[PDB]
Write a structure and sequence with these properties.
Layout: E1 6-10, H1 17-31, E2 34-38, H2 43-51, E3 59-63, H3 64-72, H4 83-86, H5 91-95, E4 98-99, E5 102-103, E6 106-111, E7 114-118, H6 132-140, H7 154-163, E8 167-172, E9 175-182, H8 186-200, H9 210-218, E10 224-227, H10 232-237, E11 242-245, E12 258-266, H11 273-284, H12 287-296, E13 301-302, H13 305-311, H14 315-326, E14 328-329, H15 336-352, H16 357-364
Parallel strand pairs: 1-2, 1-3, 12-14
Antiparallel strand pairs: 3-12, 4-5, 6-12, 6-13, 7-10, 7-11, 8-9
Helix pairs in contact: 1-12, 7-8, 8-15, 15-16
PDB class: metal binding protein
Keywords: zinc, sensing
Assembly: monomeric
Length: 366
């Protein structure tokens, strides 16, 4: 029993939930409807349990990747934004919330890896990956490394492997063709071979994980790393003058990071779908609403064009979005969990030399 004439929202405690509550207060002042924001633990696992019995929040906030599964079980309402409202958000963020061609959530905020660099070691970061070998040689002569990053998670390596034509699952008209996998094509092979060659020519250690890289960069040991917005605060405390910029090109093509979109879904069982539509479209996804959340806890880059233009006065947010626009929406289908583990094995096995680049990626595509 979801109560009528009240909105209950679930959002993870890492986002600006107090800011969201302020938006809810404006909603109540205007409508007389109470708006309750809650940050339950493991909300992404509770939601499927409770929405399956017809209960749960009216609105669920989460990374878009889980909503595909939610949509597959009919847990989310098809949303009905008019074309005038869709045009207020970046087009690619709508592709993150489509399932079987139907819009199933509102995009809120966008996150994509970026190239982080030490302005003091490297006043002008490289535009191409092809120049990192020579750059590393110049920096090694002073005991510095050009580039360190987490080679143990496919999320960090995919931007390079995807650059020349690698892709996860093909996307067409709000639909992923789960048959067409693009991990074992010439583009994917060229990118991983470049990564492997970096390891073989000693510009990169196959053992580098997330912690080593961050410590190296926060200590000035390395000129560059690849990370997302959640790492900026740590470099902030660090004594490092750092910049954030577009990732290097590979074979003249952009690096293709995976894009995550914080999305707001509507419970299919809610009796308050029009209230939720009104709250999301007209209170949250405004400059004032987003600013309220962002003021509590930074969102990074946002799907709303008008406010993103104001936020991108921060060059690091500007670069996150540039990278997101060059990147690849993370597929929201559940077979991506198998894609992660396969590519994870491929990269680790290729980087060790346990397998050639061709062998490893073949076992990924099965």
């Amino acid at each position: 029993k979801i109560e009528e004439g009240k909105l209950v929202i679930w959002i993870n405690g890492d986002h600006g939930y107090n800011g969201l509550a302020e938006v809810g207060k404006k909603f109540e002042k205007d409508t007389g409807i109470k708006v309750t924001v809650e940050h339950p633990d493991k909300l992404e696992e509770k939601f499927p349990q409770v929405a399956a019995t017809g209960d749960g929040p009216d609105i669920i906030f989460w990374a878009h990747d889980r909503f595909g599964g939610y949509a597959q079980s009919g847990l989310l309402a098809e949303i009905t934004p008019d074309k005038a409202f869709q045009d207020k958000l970046y087009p690619f963020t709508w592709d993150a919330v489509r399932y079987n061609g139907k819009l199933i959530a509102y995009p809120i905020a966008v996150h994509a890896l970026s190239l982080i660099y030490n302005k003091d070691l490297l006043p002008n970061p490289p535009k191409t990956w092809e120049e990192i070998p020579a750059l590393d040689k110049e920096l090694k002569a002073k005991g510095k490394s050009a580039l360190m990053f987490n080679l143990q998670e496919p999320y960090f390596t995919w931007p390079l492997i995807a650059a020349d034509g690698g892709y996860a699952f093909k996307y067409e008209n709000g639909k992923y063709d789960i048959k067409d996998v693009g991990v074992d094509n010439a583009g994917a092979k060229a990118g991983l071979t470049f990564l492997v060659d970096l390891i073989k020519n000693k510009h990169m250690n196959a053992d580098t994980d997330y912690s080593i890289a961050e410590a190296a960069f926060n200590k000035g040991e390395t000129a560059m790393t690849i990370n997302g917005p959640h790492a900026w605060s740590n470099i902030d405390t660090s004594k490092v003058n750092y910049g954030v910029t577009v990732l290097p090109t590979f074979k003249g093509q952009p690096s293709k990071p995976f894009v995550g979109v914080l999305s707001a879904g509507i419970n299919a069982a809610s009796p308050n779908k029009e209230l939720a539509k009104e709250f999301l479209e007209n209170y949250l996804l405004t400059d004032e609403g987003l600013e309220a959340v962002n003021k509590d806890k930074p969102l990074g880059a946002v799907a709303l064009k008008s406010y993103e233009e104001e936020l991108a006065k921060d060059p690091r947010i500007a670069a996150t979005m540039e990278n997101a626009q060059k990147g690849e929406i993370m597929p929201n289908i559940p077979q991506m969990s198998a894609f992660w583990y396969a590519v994870r094995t491929a990269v680790i096995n290729a980087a060790s030399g346990r397998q050639t680049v061709d062998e490893a990626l073949k076992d990924a595509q099965t």
